[PDB]
Design a protein around this ligand. Structure first.
Ligand SMILES: Nc1ncnc2c1ncn2[C@@H]1O[C@H](COP(=O)(O)OP(=O)(O)O)[C@@H](O)[C@H]1O
Lengths: 443, 63
């Protein structure tokens, strides 16, 4: 489909025993990281429980240690029931809005208003439409519709006859009508009438006739974020800015009104509030102004849980000239509990490579899997994982049905790991442009 | 004067000719009004003369 195979495609969840929060040694595509997966599951539990507001969790550990994978596993194990917002910290440096506004909108996106509503929908196959159009138009008309269980005839009001003519509704068409709006969606063409559709090309699909009553109440459960309500109220087509962007800085008094109204809907029982998650990937790309805003944004009642990942050691905080762990100021780190990811053992690399060789359509011979495991220890999990794809493509060039050591050796030879890449750089320093701008082009 | 009433101009509500419950549906074949598919199932397999009796209970007829 339109989803291709990607680095996290094998992550199907968090892989944790829901009855105990005990991490299974592997399941759902996660291998090892047990203590981190347990902690992320305790966070997952209190996300679903909703009662706790505005806690920040940092996931800290070396690169390629499963920090994003654990974040993806939580998103896959929350699903649609909870808003999940993913933010690269690079994203808030907008030219449309100040970074605290962008960071506000991200917090607003992570709280859902859940609104439960009903409508009568009428659905069936058009048996015939008569419209007289009596110079003039839309004067009078009759509609016959059937399911497999019933047939009925309707006199149409004139603004419904406009809708029918607007949708060019025809005998044999399977339609739904939402009654209160009066919109008509043509779900398809009935197969029994296929002969009538002489203008439709042979690529046209057909459907069986609907089933049950012509009319029923269908309940829709909308969830709309606080950010969407904020943007809707900004201007006469405010929602149109939810797509194009081009929201301004939304005025604070609009948000404060909306918070009061959402508290009314909660107290009136018309809506539920559904606290989500904001995941800030590589949070160290934020600067000292951002962290100061976050500190008090987390103290709001309508704050999500915030989950964060950092590669960084003791490192220079952006927008200042001093260093702190993770590159995060200690005053912010005071508000944050930290989950650590550790490096993988060779058998865990073997398992992750196996899983990655299941998600990609690749057969590894046992010696090729052993060699990729050895390469994974020497050159890192990510590089050996990129040799999997390379080896399959080389094997297919030699038309092999399974990837052999020869294909992995060709991969290792053709594509350098980071360490050999650095060593190549440390040897080529006269041909590569130095930090001084100096370079020699002669042989 | 003994001439003393006229029809209403309001639109009348629709009730099932069988069970008297409210009727969203009018059957185009027999012109009986019916509540649901269960009553439509009996209407379409009525004994041949019975359809005109359900109409006649509301003074309607085919002729
Ligand atoms: N415990 C694990 N189980 C399964 N796959 C993993 C695990 N850890 C890492 N991976 C995969 O290996 C790659 C690197 O891990 P990633 O989570 O991106 O590390 P980081 O986020 O720290 O850079 C990704 O494709 C990820 O899906």
């Amino acid at each position: 489909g339109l989803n291709l195979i990607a680095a996290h495609s094998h992550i199907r969840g968090l892989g944790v025993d829901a009855d105990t929060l005990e991490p299974r040694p592997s399941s759902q595509g996660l291998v090892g990281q047990e203590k981190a997966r347990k902690a992320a599951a305790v966070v997952l539990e209190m996300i679903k429980q909703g009662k706790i507001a505005g806690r920040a969790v940092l996931i800290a550990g070396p690169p390629s240690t499963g920090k994003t994978a654990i974040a993806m596993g939580m998103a896959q194990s929350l699903g649609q029931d909870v808003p999940f917002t993913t933010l690269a910290a690079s994203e808030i440096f907008s030219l449309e809005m100040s970074k605290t506004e962008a960071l506000t909108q991200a917090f607003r996106k992570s709280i859902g208003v859940r609104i439960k509503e009903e409508s009568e929908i009428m659905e069936g196959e058009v048996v015939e439409i008569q419209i007289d159009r009596s110079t003039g138009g839309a004067k009078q008309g009759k509609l016959t519709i059937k399911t497999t269980d019933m047939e009925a005839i309707y006199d149409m009001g004139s603004k419904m006859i406009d809708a029918m003519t607007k949708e060019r509704v025809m005998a044999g068409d399977i339609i739904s009508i939402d009654k209160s709006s009066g919109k008509i969606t043509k779900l398809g063409r009935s197969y029994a009438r296929s002969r009538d559709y002489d203008a439709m090309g042979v690529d046209t699909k057909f459907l069986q006739c609907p089933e049950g009553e012509l009319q029923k109440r269908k309940e829709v459960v909308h969830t709309v974020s606080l950010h969407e309500i904020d943007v809707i109220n900004s201007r006469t087509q405010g929602f149109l800015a939810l797509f194009s962007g081009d929201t301004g800085e939304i005025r604070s008094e609009i948000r404060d009104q909306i918070n009061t109204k959402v508290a009314e809907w909660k107290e009136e029982g018309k809506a539920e509030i559904v606290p989500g998650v904001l995941f800030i990937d590589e949070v160290h790309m934020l600067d000292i102004e951002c962290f100061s805003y976050i500190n008090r944004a987390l103290e709001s009642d309508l704050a999500p849980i915030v989950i964060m990942a950092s590669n960084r050691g003791v490192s220079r905080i952006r927008g200042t000239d001093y260093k702190s762990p993770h590159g995060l100021p200690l005053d912010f780190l005071d508000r944050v509990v930290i989950i650590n990811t550790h490096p993988y053992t060779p058998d865990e690399l073997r398992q992750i490579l196996s899983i990655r060789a299941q998600e990609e359509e690749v057969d590894l011979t046992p010696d090729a899997l052993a060699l990729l495991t050895k390469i994974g220890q020497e050159a890192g999990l990510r590089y050996a994982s990129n040799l999997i794809t390379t080896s399959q493509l080389i094997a297919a060039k030699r038309r092999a049905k399974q990837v052999g050591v020869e294909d992995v050796q060709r991969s290792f030879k053709l594509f350098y790991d980071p360490a050999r890449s650095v060593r190549f750089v440390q040897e080529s320093e006269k041909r590569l442009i130095g930090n001084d701008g100096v370079v020699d082009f002669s042989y | 004067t003994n001439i003393e009433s006229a029809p209403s101009l309001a639109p009348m509500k629709h009730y099932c000719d069988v069970t008297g419950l409210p009727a969203p549906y009018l059957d185009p074949k027999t012109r009986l009004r019916y509540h649901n598919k269960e009553i439509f199932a009996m209407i379409r397999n009525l004994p041949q003369g019975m359809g005109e009796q359900f109409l006649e209970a509301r003074g309607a007829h085919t002729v």
